[PDB]
Design a protein around this ligand. Structure first.
Ligand SMILES: NCCCCC[C@@H](C[SeH])C(=O)O
Ligand SMILES: C[As](C)(=O)[O-]
Ligand SMILES: [Zn+2]
Ligand SMILES: [Zn+2]
Ligand SMILES: [Zn+2]
Length: 304
């Protein structure tokens, strides 16, 4: 059923999280960090060889239900880790010295919906008071300038901020996990599509983070690294001026907790296919994105 070169439905990805953990017990363990609105387990894979006092990098995919290449990329990252550990000096060093928390799908209820009913759904599938319109934008539901700019207060809108910050079970589960592990998590990476960008804070206001120069230089070099493979062109910069203002994002929230390396990736393409990126582009998109993620990982490891 599962293939890393096709899009996999939730049943298949869930079964994969179990099987990949079973097949690689020395590098992977699996937990659930909460349940979704509909009661599905939100699985998280911890990827790394055990060791003392290891720092960690946290990566999630699948915030937005229709962005199928995001879900495929978290799977590809785990595929690379298990395949190349032992053979490739950098990935082996990475897994020996840090752990990666990989959350392959945050918004599982929306993801199921995109397979059963509406390919173009974005939000969660929770209800809203006073209306029949469904869902909240999880990337406007974090407590970071919550509901102030670039988010809608209308529950029927695609960027609805929700009833309160962390009103969604899924964003509360993610925020609780990160707060519970803040002393080990040194970087936060959140994978989306489309439009080919590497963003860092801030998006909730036009303001820049304390380590702006460092983030700017790191994002510039990771885009240069991404382009080596296929010439794919990314832009980069602080979210508010690089893409648009958007309050309530998990990247900004994570940075405000003290996680100094916080990045949002918008993968391929630039709009020819948009969210319906064909399966035939999974491999090239994931391979080039692996080069930027490994670049960032190496940097974090080298600047502890
Ligand atoms: N904190 C958001 C970073 C910039 C906007 C990201 C895009 C990904 Se689809 C969005 O959530 O609208
Ligand atoms: C092109 As977009 C910010 O709606 O993924
Ligand atoms: Zn998105
Ligand atoms: Zn996007
Ligand atoms: Zn590869």
């Amino acid at each position: 059923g599962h293939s890393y070169e096709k899009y996999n439905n939730w049943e298949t990805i869930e079964a994969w999280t179990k099987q990949v953990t079973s097949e690689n017990p020395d590098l992977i363990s699996r937990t659930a960090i909460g349940t979704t609105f509909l009661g599905n387990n939100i699985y998280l894979l911890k990827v790394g060889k055990p060791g003392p006092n290891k720092p960690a990098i946290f990566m999630d995919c699948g915030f937005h239900a229709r962005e199928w290449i995001s879900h495929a990329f978290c799977q590809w990252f785990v595929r690379e880790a298990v395949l190349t550990y032992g053979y490739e000096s950098h990935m082996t060093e990475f897994l020996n010295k840090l752990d990666f928390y990989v959350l392959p799908v945050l918004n599982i209820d929306g993801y199921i919906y995109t397979w059963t009913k509406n390919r173009m759904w974005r939000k969660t599938r929770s209800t809203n008071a006073g209306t029949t319109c469904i869902g909240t934008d999880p990337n406007r539901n974090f407590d970071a300038g919550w509901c102030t700019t670039g988010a809608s207060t209308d529950p029927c809108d695609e960027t609805y901020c929700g009833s309160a910050a962390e009103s969604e079970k899924e964003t509360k589960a993610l925020a609780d996990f990160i707060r519970n592990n803040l002393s080990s998590i040194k970087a936060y990476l959140t994978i989306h599509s489309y439009s080919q960008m590497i963003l860092y804070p801030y998006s909730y206001d036009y303001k820049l983070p304390e380590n702006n120069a460092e983030l700017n230089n790191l994002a510039k070099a990771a885009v240069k690294e991404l382009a080596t493979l296929y010439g794919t062109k990314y832009t980069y910069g602080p979210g508010a001026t690089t893409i648009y203002p958007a309050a309530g994002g998990s990247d900004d929230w994570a940075y405000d907790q003290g996680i100094k390396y916080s990045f949002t990736f918008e993968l391929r393409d630039k709009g020819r296919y948009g969210f319906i990126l064909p399966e035939s582009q999974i491999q090239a998109t994931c391979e080039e994105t692996m080069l930027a993620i490994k670049y960032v990982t190496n940097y974090v490891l080298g600047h502890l």
